[PDB]
Design a protein around this ligand. Structure first.
Ligand code: CLA
Ligand SMILES: CCCCCCCCCCCCCCCCCC(=O)OC[C@H](CO[C@@H]1O[C@H](CO)[C@H](O)[C@H](O)[C@H]1O)OC(=O)CCCCCCCCCCCCCCCCC
Ligand SMILES: CSCC[C@H](NC=O)C(=O)O
Ligand SMILES: CSCC[C@H](NC=O)C(=O)O
Ligand SMILES: [Cl-]
Ligand SMILES: [Fe+2]
Lengths: 35, 478, 63, 35, 31, 29, 72, 342, 29, 415, 32, 35, 302
C-alpha cells in the first residue's frame, strides 16, 4: 500500500505546484508589457 | 596562439628543422620495421611450413623480407622450408638489427639538425630569407630515385649482384627466391609475370634518370611556376599526398587481386581463388589424370599434396574475417595439423553427392548435397524442422580417400553430418584448437589486413590532398 | 647564418630559387608526355582488367 | 445506389465531394496572380 | 613561432569525444 | 570469453588521448 | 535574352511543328515496337522460350552474343 | 596579343546564365552522360539477362522500381566499354549485359570530380576559402567507397548498388543480412553525423528565426532583412543565454558554430565510408564472439544482439536464391531458417 | 569487461557535468 | 497589420463582420462535404454487401442512429441515407450564401451595427456570452441524440440479443456514479478510460448529463463575467482564444482516434467492420468451431485464471463482443457453453470478421483512426504555434527583439 | 544572336526530353 | 593485333574525335570570335 | 514576501544557471526518475520474459551484455497495454521479470520530454524571444512518442515499443521492416529527405558562412554554382528554410510510423509485372519482399 500512497502524494505534489504556478499571474512574468 | 592541430606548422618556413622533423619520422618508421621484425621472430613457429605457413600466423612484415631474398634466420630454420642454411648477416635478425641501428642513427641526425638549424645553405642571399629551390630539389631527388630504381632492378632483381625476388609455381607449392630476368615483350605487362617487375625497374629507373637530368637543368615555365605555386612548399605536400594515395590504391589492389609481387606462400591465397574454385579444379585435374592411369580412387587421392589441398579451404580465404576478429588465422579454426582426405558422399541409391561449398558472402550456409544433375538429394534441416531429405531418411554415407581417414567409411548419421559441414568449407582438416584457445570464427590473412589498411589510408589521404591543395592555391585568403 | 663545409658544397644547388623561363616554356612538351602517360595507364589497366586481351597472354597466376 | 429518379445526376454526384478540395487548389492562383 | 593553446571549452570537446569513442569501441575491442 | 587485450586496449584508447589533452590544457595558462 | 523569346511567335511557330513531331517520333518508337528491338528489352511474351522458365542469366564473359542468341 | 589560351580562359569565365569555367569542360559532358545514361536505362533497358528482373518503364515498372542495375557477375570487374571485348561495339548487347551501369558510374565519378573542381574554380574566382569544396568531399567519399570500392573488394560489379530507389533499398537490406551493417561502429558514427546535421539545421534555423531583431513594424519578419547589413538579424547574446539555461551549454562564436555545422555531417560521411571499405573485403563487424560463445554453451542466453543474428540468417537464406540468380542456389524448405524450428 | 563499460559511461557524464557547472563564462563578440 | 499573402486570414482578426463571413462560408464547406460525400457513398453502395467492405464512413454513422437498418445490420431502407445527404447539400447552400454575404457585402465591422453581435476580442463579458449561446446549443444537440434514442425510433444497439437491432432506450443510465466513473478509469489495458463504454444506456444516459451540463454552463456564462483567477491566468485576445480551441481539438482528435479503434458499441462492427482486436478473436473462435469436427487446442488459462483464446490472439483477451459474450461466463469463456451454446449467427458473424485477420484492404476504422491521430497531432502543433504567438504578441515582442531594450543585455551574467 | 550557348544547353537537354516523354506517354497504352 | 586491341586503338582515335573536333577547336573558335 | 512568492521567484528566475520554470518542476523529477531507473536497469536488471512463454531476453550489463547489445527490454507480452506500476506487481521479482522497468522509464521520459517542450517556450517567453523553438523540437518529440507510445497502442502491447538499447533499436527497425516494408512507405522517404536534406543544408550553410569571413561574397558564389536563383538573398528566409526542412520531414515520418501502428502500411508492388502466360517477372521490389519474408518468418514462433 505505502508505495502507491507515497507516489500518489509525490505526483500530487508536483502537478498542482505546476498548476498553481501558472495561475499565479504567469502572463505578467515577462520583460515586455504586463496586463 | 597555435591550436593543437597546427603545432607542426612551426617548421613551415624553417628548412633545417623540417629536415630534422623528417629525420625523426624516418627514425620512427625504421624503428618500427626493425622491432616489428623482432616481435614476429619471437612468436614465429618455424616447424611446419605446409599447414602452418607464415600467413596463417599473422606475420605481416615477415613476408616482405622473404619477397626480396631474406629467407633464413640465424637460428637455422628458413621460410622456404629448409633448415640449417648459411644466410650470413642478411637473415631476418640481421635485417631487423640493421633497421634498429639505422633508426638510432636517424635519431641522432635529427637532433643535430634541430639544434643547428640556421645553416647558411638554406639562406637566400638576395633577400636574406630562408628559401628552397623546390624545382631543383625535385630534380636531384628524381635523379637519385632513378638510379636507386635502376640499380634495384638491374642488380638485385636480375640477380646480377643480388638475390633476386620470390617466384613460385601458379599454385604456390614450390616457391623460393631466384634471379628473375626482365621481360621486354608485351608479356612484361602481365601482372603475374615476375619478369615484368624487373623490366619495369630498369626502364622506369632509366626514365627517372633522364627526367631527373631534365629537371636539374631546365627551369620551370613562368606560367606553370605561378599556376602551381611552385614557390610554396605546401604545393609539394599537395602533389606528394596525391601521388601516395594513388600508389596506396594500387598496392591495395595488387594485394587483393594478387600479382607476382604478392605470392600466396607469403600472403595467403586470394578471395577470388575460392570463388572460382582455382585450387579445387587443379586438384581434380591431378586426380583425374591419375584415375586415367588406371589407378585406384585412393591411389589418385593420395598423390594430392596437403599444401595444395590446404589452399582449397575457405578458412584460408582473406574474405572470411572480421574487423575486430584480431590476431592470426590460427586464433580462428586453430592450427591446421593434417588433412583428413577427400570425402565421397553417397545416398542409399548409390548416387554420388556433392556438398555445396560456402560462398564468401555467407556467415552461414545451409548444408546441401546435390547429385550429378544438381538435384538436391540430401541436406541437414535447419534446426528442428521436418524434412524429406535428411541424412537419416536418405541414408547418406561418406568414405574418404587419401589423407588421415583413407580407406574408412562413415554411415553413422552423426559423423556424416559432421563431415558434410567440413565439406561445405572445402577440404577438411584437423585443427589444434588448444594451443591458442581458438574461438572458431575465421580471421583474415595478412593479404586482407594490408588491403584494408591501405585502402582506408588511400581514401583518407585523398582528403589531405584536397585540403593541402586548397591551402596552396588559396594561400592569400587563408 | 652558420656556414659549414658541406653547406658550402651544396650552395650552388640551392642558388637559383625563383628563376623561371618566361612565358610557356616547355609546357607543350609536358602536355604531350602527360598524354602518353594517360594512354599508358589505360593500357596496363585494361590488361589487368582483361578488357584488353593481347597475343600470347593470360592475366592469370599461370603466366 | 441513388433512387431511380436521381440516377440522372450520377456523373455530377461522383464529382461533388472533391469540389471543396479544388477551390483550395484554385485560390492559390486567385491570390497568387493578383498578388 | 607560437606556443600551443588549448582553452577550457576545447578541453571538454576533446574529453567528450574521447570518452564517447571509448564508449563506442569498448564493446568491439572486448569482442 | 572476452579478448585478453580488450581491457588494455579500451583503457589506452581513452587514457592516452585524455592525458595528452590535460597536459595540453595544464601547460597553457 | 529570355523574355522576348517566350513572348514572341517566331519562337512559338517553329515549335508548333517541332515539339509535336518530336513527341510523335517518341510515341512511334514505342508504339511500333522499335524500343524493344533497339535496347534488347523482352516483349511481354519474349521473357521465356516455349517452355524454359530458366532466367537467361549470363554465364560467360566474352561470347555473350552467342549466349543471348541461344537464350532466345 | 592574348594568345589562344587566355582568350579561351577569359571566355570560360564570362558572366552568363551558368558558369562554365575550366571544370565545366569535364563536369558538363560527364554529368550529361551520367544522368542521360540513367534515364535511358530506367526507361528502355532491362535487367533480365543480368539479374532476372524487370527494371525499365518499358517493362511496366514504376518510378520506384526502375533502376540502372549492376552488370552480370560473369563479367567480374570488367569496365564493359561499348567497344570492349564483351559487347564488341554491339550496342543492344551492351544494354542487355548491364553495360549502362559502369557508364553511369564512371561518368558520375568524373562528373563529381568536375563539380568539386567547379567549387574550387568559383571560390578562387570570388576570392573566398573553398570550404564548400572540402565539404563536398563527404559525398564524394561515400560515392567512391560504396559505388566503386565496395564492388571492387567484392567479386564483381554485380554487388554494387543499382541506380534506383528499390535497387538502393536492396543494397541496404543486403548489407544488413550479409554484413550486419547496423552493428558496425563506423556506420554508427555516420548515423550520428547525419542525424546530428539534421539536428543542427533544425535548431540553428529555429534559433535565428526566434532570436530575430525587431527591425520592422510589419508582422512579416521576412521583410526586415535586406542583403546589405552591417549588423546581424538575430541576437547571439540572447540565443547564447537561452541555450545555456535550457541545454546547459551554448555557442559563443558564430565562426565555431558554423564550422560545427560543416564538420559534423561531413565527418559522419567520412567515417561511414571507412566502414564501407571494410565491408568491401568482408572485414565486417558482424559478431561479438563472447556472446556467440555463451549462446552456444547456454541455450537460455538470449540478447537483442543474438536476436539480430537470427534475423540476418533468415534474410540471407530467403533472399539469396533470387538476389543472386547466377549462383543457382537451391534451398529446400527444410533448410530455410524460420522461428518455428528454433 | 563490465567494469570498463561502467568506467567509460561514467566518464562521459563527468565531462557533461564539468562542461556545464565549470565552464569558462561566454564572452559573445 | 501587414501580413503576407500566406497569412492573409490574419488580416481578418479585427474585422468582426468580415470574419463572420469566413466562418459561415467555411461552415458551408463542412455541410457540403457531409452532404456530398453521403450522396457519393450511397451512389456506390451495395445495400446487402457489408458496409465496411465498400469504404463507407458516413453511412455507418447514419446506420448507428437507426436510420434505414434492421436487426443485425441489414439496410432496410436506402432512402433515409439519401435524405440526410440531401438535407445537408441544400443547407450548405444557405450557409455558403450567408458567408459570401458577410465576407463580401455585409458590414466589415459589427460594433457599428449591433451591440449584441458586435464583439471585441478583449471584452470578456461579450466573449463569455458567445460561449453561452453555443454551450446552450451544444447541450441541445446532445439532447437531440437522447431524443432520437428514446422517443424517435431508437439507436442501433449492437448488444441486443441475437445479433444487433435498433432499440429504443427507455432506461438510460442516470446514476452519476456510473456516468462520472467512466471519467476516472485508467486509460490503460483492461480499463479503457471512456472508450470502454459498452452499452447504449450508458451512452444515452451520458448525453443527458452532457445535455444538461452544457446548458448549465451556457446559462452560467450568459449571466456572469470571468472571475479574478480567470482574468489573471488567461490571455484575452483573438489568437489566444483560437489556441485554446486548437488544444481542445487536438485533445478530441486523439480521443476519437482511439475510440473508433477499440470501441464497438458506438461503432458497431455491423457497419464499421470488426476492430483489429475483434478480427483476431474471430479467427481463433472460427478455427475452434471448425476443428470441433482449460486447454483444447485454441484455449489457454490466463495467469489471471481466466480461459482465453490462445496464440497470437493472446494479447486481445480484453476484447468483449456481442457474438462472444453469450459463450463467456464468470471465469471467462465457459468450456461447454463453447461446446453446446454456439448459435449459427455467431458462427456466421465470427467468420465475416476473420476475413482480414493476420495470416490490399484498409478497414474503415484504420482510415478513421489514422486520419484523426494525424489531425489531432498537427492541431497540437498549431496550438503551440498560436499559444506561443498569442502570449508573445500580448507581451509585445512577437515581431522580434528590440535592439534598444533587449531584455538579455540588462540581465547579469550567468556565471 | 540565336546560336548562343543557351541554344545548345537547352536543346541537347530538351530534344531528348520530348522524345522520352513521347515514349513514356505511349508506354501507358501497352496493355500488359 | 587482337580484336580487343584494334577496338582499343579505335577508342583513342574516336575518343579524340570528340575531344579535339569539335570540342577544343569549337571553344577556341567561339572564343577567338567572341573576343 | 510570502514564502510562496519567494519560491515562485526562484522557479521563474532567469538568473539561475539552468532555468527551472514551471514546466521544469514537472520535467526535472520525471527525467531524473527516468534517468535513475534507466541506468540501474541498463546495468543490473534481470532478464525479461518479453514473449510470454518463459523465454527471457537478457538486457543488462551484469547479465552478459556490452554497451552495444545492452538494452532495457520492453514489457512482457503478458502485460499488453496494461498499466504496470511497481505496486501493481505482487513482487519486485515479478515486476522486473515482466518488463516493469520499461514502463516506468518510458512513461517518465515521455512526460519529461513534453515538459521539456513547455519549458523551451517558458524561457523563450521570459527572455523576450519569439516562442517557436519548442515547435521545431516537437518533431523529435512526435517521433519518440510514435515508437514508444503510439505504435504499442495500435499493435496492442507495450512489448511492441522500441527497446531502450542500441541493438534493441536495430531489432525494432528490422521487424518493423519485415511486417510493414517501411522503406517503400512514402512518409519514410520524406523523413529520409528530411535528415539527408537537413544534413546537406547544415553542411551547405556552415561551409558558406565560414568561407565568407574576412560579407556578401557567399551569396554570389552559390549563385554561380547553381542557375543563379537557387539561393535566398534574404538571410531570414534562409534560416526559416533551415529549421523547417528537417522539422517537416521528421514530422511526416513520425506520422508515418503512427499510421502504420494501425497497420496502414507502405507501398506494395508485388506481383506487379507478369508475362503473357501469367508468370511473375520480378522487379527490385520482389527481392525486397524476400528479405522481408526472410526477416519475418524468423520472427514468429508458429
Ligand atoms: C597498415 C599497417 C598494418 C597492417 C596491415 C597490420 C596487420 C596485422 N598486424 Mg600489425 N601493427 C602495426 C601495423 C599493421 N599491422 C603497427 C604500426 C604496430 C605497432 C603498434 C603493429 C603491431 C602488431 C602486434 C603486436 C600484432 C600485430 C598483428 C597483425 C596481424 C593481425 C592484426 C589484427 O588483429 O587486426 C586488428 C585491427 C583492428 C582491431 C582495427 C583497429 C581499428 C581502429 C580501432 C580504428 C580507430 C577508429 C578511429 C579512432 C575513429 C576516428 C575518429 C573520428 C571521430 C575522426 C595483421 C596481419 C598481430 C599478429 O598477428 O601477430 C603476428 C599482433 O599480435 N600488429
Ligand atoms: C603510448 C601509446 C600509443 C597509443 C596507443 C593507442 C592504443 C589504442 C588501443 C588500440 C586500438 C586497437 C585495439 C584492438 C583490440 C586489440 O587489443 O587487438 C590486439 C591485436 C593483437 O591480437 C592478438 O594477436 C595474437 C597473435 O599471436 C593472437 O592471435 C591473439 O589472439 C590476438 O588477440 O593487436 C593488433 O592486432 C595490432 C593492430 C595494428 C594495426 C592492424 C591493422 C590496422 C590497419 C588499419 C587501421 C586503420 C584505421 C583507420 C580508421 C579511421
Ligand atoms: C511490489 S510493492 C506491492 C505494493 C506496495 N507494497 C509496499 O510498499 C505498495 O504500494
Ligand atoms: C571481476 S572483474 C574481472 C573483469 C570484469 N568482468 C566481469 O565481471 C570487469 O572488469
Ligand atoms: Cl527477433
Ligand atoms: Fe547563420
Amino acid at each position: 500500500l505505502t508505495l502507491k500512497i507515497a507516489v500518489y502524494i509525490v505526483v500530487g505534489l508536483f502537478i498542482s505546484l505546476f498548476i498553481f504556478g501558472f495561475l499565479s499571474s504567469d502572463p505578467t512574468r515577462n520583460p515586455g508589457r504586463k496586463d | 596562439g597555435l591550436p593543437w592541430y597546427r603545432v607542426h606548422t612551426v617548421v613551415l618556413n624553417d628548412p633545417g628543422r623540417l629536415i630534422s622533423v623528417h629525420l625523426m619520422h624516418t627514425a620512427l618508421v625504421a624503428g618500427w620495421a626493425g622491432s616489428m621484425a623482432l616481435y614476429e621472430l619471437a612468436i614465429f613457429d618455424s616447424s611446419d611450413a605446409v599447414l602452418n605457413p607464415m600467413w596463417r600466423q599473422g606475420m605481416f612484415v615477415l613476408p616482405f623480407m622473404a619477397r626480396l631474398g631474406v629467407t633464413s634466420s640465424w637460428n637455422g630454420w628458413s621460410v622456404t622450408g629448409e633448415t640449417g642454411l648459411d644466410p650470413g648477416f642478411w637473415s631476418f635478425e640481421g635485417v631487423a638489427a640493421a633497421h634498429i641501428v639505422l633508426s638510432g642513427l636517424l635519431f641522432l641526425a635529427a637532433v643535430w639538425h634541430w639544434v643547428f638549424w640556421d645553416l647558411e645553405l638554406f639562406v637566400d642571399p638576395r633577400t636574406g630569407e630562408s628559401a628552397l629551390d623546390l624545382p631543383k630539389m625535385f630534380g636531384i631527388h628524381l635523379f637519385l630515385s632513378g638510379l636507386l630504381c635502376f640499380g634495384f632492378g638491374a642488380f638485385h632483381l636480375t640477380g646480377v649482384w643480388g638475390p633476386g625476388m620470390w617466384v613460385s609455381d601458379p599454385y604456390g607449392l614450390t616457391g623460393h627466391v631466384q634471379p628473375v630476368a626482365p621481360e621486354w615483350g608485351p608479356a612484361g605487362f602481365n601482372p603475374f609475370n615476375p619478369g615484368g617487375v624487373v623490366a619495369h625497374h630498369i626502364a622506369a629507373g632509366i626514365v627517372g634518370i633522364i627526367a631527373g637530368l631534365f629537371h636539374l637543368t631546365v627551369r620551370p615555365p613562368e606560367r606553370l611556376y605561378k599556376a602551381l605555386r611552385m614557390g610554396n612548399i605546401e604545393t609539394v605536400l599537395s602533389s606528394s599526398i596525391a601521388a601516395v594515395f594513388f600508389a596506396a590504391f594500387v598496392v591495395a589492389g595488387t594485394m587483393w587481386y594478387g600479382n607476382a609481387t604478392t605470392p600466396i606462400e607469403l600472403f595467403g591465397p586470394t578471395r577470388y581463388q575460392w570463388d572460382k574454385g582455382y585450387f579445387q579444379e587443379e586438384i581434380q585435374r591431378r586426380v583425374d589424370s591419375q584415375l586415367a592411369e588406371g589407378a585406384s580412387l585412393s591411389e589418385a587421392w593420395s598423390t594430392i599434396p596437403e599444401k595444395l589441398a590446404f589452399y582449397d579451404y575457405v578458412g584460408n580465404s582473406p574474405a572470411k574475417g572480421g574487423l575486430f576478429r584480431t590476431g592470426a588465422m590460427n586464433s580462428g579454426d586453430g592450427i591446421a595439423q593434417e588433412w583428413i582426405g577427400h570425402p565421397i558422399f553417397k545416398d542409399k541409391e548409390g548416387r554420388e553427392l556433392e556438398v555445396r561449398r560456402m560462398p564468401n558472402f555467407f556467415e552461414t550456409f545451409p548444408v546441401i548435397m546435390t547429385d550429378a544433375d544438381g538435384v538436391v538429394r540430401a541436406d541437414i534441416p535447419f534446426r528442428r524442422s521436418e524434412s524429406k531429405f535428411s541424412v537419416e531418411q536418405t541414408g547418406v554415407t561418406v568414405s574418404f580417400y587419401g589423407g588421415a581417414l583413407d580407406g574408412q567409411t562413415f554411415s553413422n548419421p552423426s559423423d556424416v553430418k559432421k563431415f558434410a559441414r567440413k565439406a561445405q568449407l572445402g577440404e577438411g582438416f584437423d585443427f589444434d584448437t588448444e594451443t591458442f584457445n581458438s574461438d572458431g570464427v575465421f580471421r583474415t590473412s595478412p593479404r586482407g589486413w594490408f588491403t584494408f589498411g591501405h585502402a582506408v589510408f588511400a581514401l583518407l589521404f585523398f582528403f589531405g590532398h584536397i585540403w593541402h591543395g586548397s591551402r596552396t592555391l588559396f594561400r592569400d585568403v587563408f | 647564418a652558420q656556414r659549414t663545409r658541406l653547406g658550402d658544397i651544396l650552395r650552388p644547388l640551392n642558388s637559383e630559387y625563383g628563376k623561371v623561363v618566361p612565358g610557356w616554356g616547355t609546357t607543350p612538351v609536358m602536355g604531350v608526355f602527360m598524354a602518353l602517360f594517360l594512354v599508358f595507364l589505360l593500357i596496363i589497366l585494361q590488361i589487368y582488367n582483361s578488357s584488353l586481351i593481347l597475343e600470347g597472354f593470360s592475366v592469370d597466376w599461370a603466366g | 445506389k441513388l433512387p431511380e429518379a436521381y440516377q440522372i445526376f450520377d456523373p455530377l454526384v461522383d464529382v461533388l465531394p472533391v469540389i471543396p478540395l479544388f477551390f483550395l487548389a484554385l485560390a492559390f492562383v486567385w491570390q497568387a496572380a493578383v498578388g | 613561432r607560437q606556443p600551443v593553446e588549448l582553452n577550457r571549452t576545447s578541453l571538454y570537446l576533446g574529453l567528450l569525444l574521447v570518452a564517447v569513442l571509448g564508449i563506442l569501441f569498448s564493446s568491439y575491442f572486448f569482442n | 570469453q572476452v579478448n585478453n587485450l580488450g581491457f588494455i586496449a579500451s583503457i589506452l584508447f581513452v587514457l592516452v588521448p585524455t592525458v595528452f589533452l590535460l597536459i595540453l590544457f595544464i601547460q597553457t595558462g | 535574352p529570355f523574355s522576348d523569346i517566350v513572348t514572341s511567335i517566331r519562337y512559338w511557330v517553329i515549335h508548333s511543328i517541332t515539339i509535336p513531331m518530336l513527341f510523335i517520333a517518341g510515341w512511334l518508337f514505342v508504339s511500333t515496337g522499335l524500343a524493344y528491338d533497339a535496347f534488347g528489352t523482352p516483349r511481354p511474351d519474349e521473357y521465356f522460350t516455349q517452355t524454359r522458365q530458366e532466367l537467361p542469366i549470363l554465364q560467360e564473359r566474352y561470347d555473350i552474343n552467342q549466349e543471348i542468341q541461344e537464350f532466345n | 596579343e592574348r594568345g589562344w589560351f587566355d582568350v579561351l580562359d577569359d571566355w570560360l569565365k564570362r558572366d552568363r546564365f551558368v558558369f562554365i569555367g575550366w571544370s565545366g569542360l569535364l563536369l558538363f559532358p560527364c554529368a550529361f552522360m551520367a544522368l542521360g545514361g540513367w534515364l535511358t536505362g530506367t526507361t528502355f533497358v532491362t535487367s533480365w539477362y543480368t539479374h532476372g528482373l524487370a527494371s525499365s518503364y518499358l517493362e511496366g515498372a514504376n518510378f520506384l522500381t526502375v533502376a540502372v542495375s549492376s552488370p552480370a557477375d560473369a563479367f567480374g570487374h570488367s569496365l564493359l566499354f561499348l567497344w570492349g571485348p564483351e559487347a564488341q561495339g554491339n550496342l543492344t548487347r551492351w544494354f542487355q549485359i548491364g553495360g549502362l551501369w559502369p557508364f553511369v558510374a564512371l561518368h558520375g565519378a568524373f562528373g563529381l570530380i568536375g563539380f568539386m573542381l567547379r567549387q574550387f574554380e568559383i571560390s578562387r574566382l570570388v576570392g573566398i576559402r573553398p570550404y564548400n569544396a572540402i565539404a563536398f568531399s563527404g559525398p564524394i567519399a561515400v560515392f567512391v567507397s560504396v559505388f566503386l570500392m565496395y564492388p571492387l573488394g567484392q567479386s564483381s560489379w554485380f554487388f554494387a548498388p543499382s541506380f534506383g530507389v528499390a535497387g538502393i533499398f536492396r543494397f541496404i537490406l543486403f548489407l544488413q543480412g550479409f554484413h550486419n551493417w547496423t552493428l558496425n561502429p563506423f556506420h554508427m558514427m555516420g548515423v550520428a553525423g547525419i542525424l546530428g546535421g539534421a539536428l543542427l539545421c533544425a535548431i540553428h534555423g529555429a534559433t535565428v528565426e526566434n532570436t530575430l531583431f525587431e527591425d520592422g513594424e510589419d508582422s512579416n519578419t521576412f521583410r526586415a532583412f535586406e542583403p546589405t547589413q552591417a549588423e546581424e538579424t538575430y541576437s547571439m547574446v540572447t540565443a547564447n543565454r537561452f541555450w545555456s539555461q535550457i541545454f546547459g551549454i551554448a555557442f559563443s562564436n558564430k565562426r565555431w558554430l558554423h564550422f560545427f555545422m560543416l564538420f559534423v555531417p561531413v565527418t559522419g560521411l567520412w567515417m561511414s565510408s571507412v566502414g564501407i571499405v571494410g565491408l568491401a573485403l568482408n572485414l565486417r563487424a558482424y559478431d561479438f564472439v563472447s556472446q556467440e560463445l555463451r549462446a552456444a554453451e547456454d541455450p537460455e542466453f538470449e540478447t537483442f544482439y543474438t536476436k539480430n543474428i537470427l534475423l540476418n540468417e533468415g534474410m540471407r537464406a530467403w533472399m539469396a536464391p533470387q538476389d543472386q540468380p547466377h549462383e543457382n542456389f537451391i534451398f529446400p524448405e527444410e533448410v530455410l531458417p524460420r522461428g518455428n524450428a528454433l | 569487461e563490465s567494469v570498463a563499460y561502467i568506467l567509460v559511461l561514467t566518464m562521459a557524464l563527468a565531462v557533461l557535468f564539468f562542461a556545464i557547472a565549470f565552464r569558462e563564462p561566454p564572452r559573445i563578440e | 497589420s501587414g501580413f503576407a499573402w500566406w497569412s492573409g486570414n490574419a488580416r481578418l482578426i479585427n474585422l468582426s463582420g468580415k470574419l463572420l463571413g469566413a466562418h459561415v462560408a467555411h461552415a458551408g464547406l463542412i455541410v457540403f462535404w457531409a452532404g456530398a460525400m453521403t450522396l457519393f457513398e450511397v451512389a456506390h453502395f451495395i445495400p446487402e454487401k457489408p458496409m465496411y467492405e465498400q469504404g463507407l464512413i458516413l453511412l455507418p454513422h447514419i446506420a448507428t442512429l437507426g436510420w434505414g437498418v434492421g436487426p443485425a445490420g441489414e439496410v432496410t431502407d436506402i432512402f433515409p441515407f439519401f435524405v440526410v445527404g440531401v438535407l445537408h447539400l441544400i443547407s450548405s447552400a444557405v450557409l455558403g450564401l450567408g458567408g459570401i454575404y458577410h465576407a463580401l457585402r455585409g458590414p466589415e465591422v459589427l460594433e457599428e451595427y449591433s451591440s449584441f453581435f458586435g464583439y471585441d476580442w478583449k471584452d470578456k463579458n461579450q466573449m463569455t456570452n458567445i460561449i453561452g449561446y453555443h454551450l446552450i446549443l451544444l447541450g441541445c444537440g446532445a439532447l437531440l441524440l437522447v431524443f432520437k434514442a428514446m422517443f424517435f425510433g431508437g439507436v442501433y444497439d449492437t448488444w441486443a440479443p441475437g445479433g444487433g437491432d435498433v432499440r429504443v432506450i427507455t432506461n438510460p443510465t442516470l446514476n452519476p456514479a456510473i456516468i462520472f466513473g467512466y471519467l476516472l478509469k485508467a486509460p490503460f489495458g483492461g480499463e479503457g478510460w471512456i472508450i470502454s463504454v459498452n452499452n447504449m444506456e450508458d451512452i444515452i444516459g451520458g448525453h443527458i448529463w452532457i445535455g444538461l451540463i452544457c446548458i448549465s454552463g451556457g446559462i452560467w456564462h450568459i449571466l456572469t463575467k470571468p472571475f479574478g483567477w480567470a482574468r489573471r491566468a488567461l490571455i484575452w485576445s483573438g489568437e489566444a482564444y483560437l489556441s485554446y480551441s486548437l488544444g481542445a481539438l487536438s485533445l478530441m482528435g486523439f480521443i476519437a482516434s482511439v475510440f473508433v479503434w477499440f470501441n464497438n458499441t458506438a461503432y458497431p462492427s455491423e457497419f464499421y467492420g470488426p476492430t483489429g482486436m475483434e478480427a483476431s478473436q474471430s479467427q481463433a473462435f472460427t478455427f475452434l468451431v471448425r476443428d470441433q469436427r482449460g486447454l483444447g487446442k485454441y484455449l489457454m488459462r490466463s495467469p489471471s485464471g481466466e480461459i482465453i483464446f490462445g496464440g497470437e490472439t493472446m494479447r486481445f483477451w480484453d476484447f468483449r463482443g456481442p457474438w462472444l459474450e453469450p459463450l463467456r461466463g464468470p471465469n471467462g469463456l465457459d468450456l461447454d457453453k463453447l461446446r453446446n451454446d454456439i448459435q449459427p449467427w455467431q458462427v456466421r458473424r465470427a467468420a465475416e470478421y476473420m476475413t482480414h485477420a493476420p495470416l490490399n484492404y484498409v478497414s474503415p476504422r484504420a482510415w478513421l483512426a489514422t486520419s484523426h491521430f494525424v489531425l489531432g497531432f498537427f492541431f497540437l502543433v498549431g496550438h503551440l504555434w498560436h499559444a506561443g504567438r498569442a502570449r508573445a504578441a500580448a507581451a509585445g515582442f512577437e515581431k522580434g527583439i528590440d535592439r534598444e531594450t533587449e531584455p538579455t543585455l540588462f540581465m547579469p551574467d550567468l556565471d | 544572336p540565336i546560336f548562343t550557348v543557351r541554344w545548345l544547353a537547352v536543346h541537347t537537354l530538351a530534344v531528348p526530353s520530348v522524345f522520352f516523354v513521347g515514349a513514356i506517354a505511349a508506354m501507358q497504352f501497352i496493355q500488359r | 593485333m587482337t580484336p580487343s586491341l584494334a577496338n582499343f586503338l579505335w577508342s583513342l582515335v574516336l575518343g579524340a574525335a570528340i575531344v579535339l573536333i569539335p570540342a577544343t577547336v569549337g571553344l577556341i573558335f567561339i572564343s577567338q570570335k567572341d573576343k | 514576501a510570502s514564502l510562496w512568492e519567494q519560491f515562485c521567484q526562484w522557479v521563474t528566475s532567469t538568473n539561475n544557471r539552468i532555468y527551472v520554470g514551471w514546466f521544469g518542476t514537472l520535467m526535472i523529477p520525471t527525467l531524473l526518475t527516468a534517468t535513475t531507473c534507466f541506468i540501474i536497469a541498463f546495468i543490473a536488471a534481470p532478464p525479461v520474459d518479453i514473449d510470454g512463454i518463459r523465454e527471457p531476453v537478457a538486457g543488462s550489463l551484469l547479465y552478459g551484455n556490452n554497451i552495444i547489445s545492452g538494452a532495457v527490454v520492453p514489457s512482457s507480452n503478458a502485460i499488453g497495454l496494461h498499466f504496470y506500476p511497481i505496486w501493481e506487481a505482487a513482487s519486485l521479482d515479478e515486476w522486473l521479470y515482466n518488463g516493469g522497468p520499461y514502463q516506468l522509464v518510458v512513461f517518465h521520459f515521455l512526460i519529461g520530454i513534453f515538459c521539456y517542450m513547455g519549458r523551451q517556450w517558458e524561457l523563450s517567453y521570459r527572455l523576450g524571444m519569439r516562442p517557436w523553438i519548442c515547435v521545431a523540437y516537437s518533431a523529435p518529440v512526435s517521433a519518440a512518442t510514435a515508437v514508444f507510445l503510439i505504435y504499442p497502442i495500435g499493435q496492442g502491447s507495450f512489448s511492441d515499443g522500441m527497446p531502450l538499447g542500441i541493438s534493441g533499436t536495430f531489432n525494432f527497425m528490422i521487424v518493423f521492416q519485415a511486417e510493414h516494408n517501411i522503406l517503400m512507405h512514402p512518409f519514410h522517404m520524406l523523413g529520409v529527405a528530411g535528415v539527408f536534406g537537413g544534413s546537406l543544408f547544415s553542411a551547405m550553410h556552415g561551409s558558406l558562412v565560414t568561407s565568407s569571413l574576412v560579407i556578401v561574397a557567399a551569396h554570389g558564389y552559390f549563385g554561380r554554382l547553381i542557375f543563379q536563383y537557387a539561393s535566398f538573398n534574404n538571410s531570414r528566409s534562409l534560416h526559416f528554410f533551415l529549421g523547417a526542412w528537417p522539422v517537416i520531414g521528421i514530422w511526416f515520418t513520425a506520422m508515418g510510423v503512427s499510421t502504420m501502428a494501425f497497420n496502414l502500411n507502405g507501398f506494395n508492388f508485388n506481383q506487379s509485372i507478369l508475362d503473357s502466360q501469367g508468370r511473375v517477372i520480378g522487379t527490385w521490389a520482389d527481392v525486397l519482399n524476400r528479405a522481408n519474408i526472410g526477416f519475418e518468418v524468423m520472427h514468429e514462433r508458429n
